[PDB]
Amino acid sequence: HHWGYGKHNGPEHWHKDFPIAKGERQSPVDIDTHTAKYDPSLKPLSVSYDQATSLRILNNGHAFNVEFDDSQDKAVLKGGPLDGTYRLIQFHFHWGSLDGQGSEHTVDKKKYAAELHLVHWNTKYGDFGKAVQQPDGLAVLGIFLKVGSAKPGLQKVVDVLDSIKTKGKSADFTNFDPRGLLPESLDYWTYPGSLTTPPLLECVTWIVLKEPISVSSEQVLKFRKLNFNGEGEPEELMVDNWRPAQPLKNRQIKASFK
Numbered sequence: 093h094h095w096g097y098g099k100h101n102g103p104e105h106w107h108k109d110f111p112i113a114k115g116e117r118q119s120p121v122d123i124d125t126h127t128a129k130y131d132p133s134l135k136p137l138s139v140s141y142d143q144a145t146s147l148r149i150l151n152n153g154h155a156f157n158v159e160f161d162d163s164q165d166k167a168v169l170k171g172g173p174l175d176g177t178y179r180l181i182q183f184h185f186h187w188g189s190l191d192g193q194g195s196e197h198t199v200d201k202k203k204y205a206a207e208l209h210l211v212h213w214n215t216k217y218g219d220f221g222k223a224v225q226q227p228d229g230l231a232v233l234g235i236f237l238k239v240g241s242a243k244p245g246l247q248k249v250v251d252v253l254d255s256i257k258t259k260g261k262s263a264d265f266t267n268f269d270p271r272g273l274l275p276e277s278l279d280y281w282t283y284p285g286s287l288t289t290p291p292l293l294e295c296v297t298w299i300v301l302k303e304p305i306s307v308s309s310e311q312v313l314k315f316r317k318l319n320f321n322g323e324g325e326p327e328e329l330m331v332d333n334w335r336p337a338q339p340l341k342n343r344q345i346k347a348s349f350k
C-alpha cells in the first residue's frame with residue numbers, strides 16, 4: 093500500500109508515512125501575486141544549460157524523469173536567490189486529467205494544465221543524497237504549462253513516451269536540450285519549501301517562473317496516455333499526479349520583478 097495520487101493513497105494520506113507532510117515549509121503553495129513583495133536584492137537567474145547531457149527517460153510509477161549526467165559541472169543554476177552553484181540532475185512534470193488542473197503551484201488560485209520541475213543540487217554537498225538532507229540542498233526551477241501553441245522543444249519528449257508507458261520502463265534519451273523548455277522571461281517568485289512527493293524533505297529553494305510555456309492539446313494528451321501501473325497490471329492512466337497547495341505558514345514569497 094505505497095503512496096500515490098488515488099483516494100486511498102493520495103496526498104491527504106502521505107502524513108501517516110511522512111509526518112513532515114504537515115511541516116513548516118511544505119510545497120507547493122499558492123502564489124498570491126499582490127502579497128509577493130518585489131525584492132530589489134534578488135539577482136537575475138543564471139541558467140547555463142549549453143553543456144547539459146541527457147542520458148535516459150524513466151517512468152517511475154508517479155511521473156517520467158528525464159535524467160542528466162551530473163558527474164561534471166556542466167548544466168548549472170546559480171544567481172537569483174541562490175548562494176553557490178546547483179547542478180541539474182533531472183526534470184519531470186505534474187499534469188491533470190483536464191486542462192483546468194495539473195500544476196502544483198497556483199497563481200492567485202489559478203491552476204495551469206501542467207508544471208515542469210528542473211531539479212538541481214547544491215554542489216557544496218558533493219552528491220544529491222547528501223544535498224536533500226540540507227535546508228539549502230536543492231533548487232527547483234518551476235515552469236507552468238498552458239495549452240495553446242505547440243512547444244517544438246517538447247516534442248522529442250512527447251514522442252518517446254509510447255516506449256515508457258508503464259512503471260519501471262526506461263528508454264535511452266541522449267542529446268535532449270532543456271533550453272527548448274524555457275520561456276522568454278526569467279522573471280520569478282522564490283520561497284523556501286520542500287519536495288512535493290514523499291519523502292517531502294524540506295530541502296528546496298523554489299524558483300517559479302512567472303511566464304508559462306505554451307504546449308499543444310496533442311502534446312499534453314500524450315502525457316495523459318502514460319500509466320501509473322506496471323506492464324500487465326490493470327490500466328491506471330497517469331493523470332492528476334499533483335500535490336495541492338499547502339499552508340504558507342511563516343514564509344514570504346519574493347518577486348524578482350516589479
Ligand SMILES: C[C@@H]1CC(=O)[C@@]2(C)CC[C@H]3[C@@H](CC[C@@H]4C[C@H](OS(N)(=O)=O)CC[C@@]43C)[C@H]12
Pocket residue numbers: 119157182209211224232286287288289290291296
Ligand atoms: C532521489 C530522491 C530521494 C527520494 O527518495 C526520491 C527518489 C523521491 C522522489 C524524488 C527524488 C528526487 C528527484 C525528484 C524531486 C521531486 O520533487 S519536486 N516535485 O519537488 O521537484 C520529487 C520526485 C523525485 C523523483 C528523491
Ligand SMILES: [Zn+2]
Pocket residue numbers: 184185186209288
Ligand atoms: Zn515535481
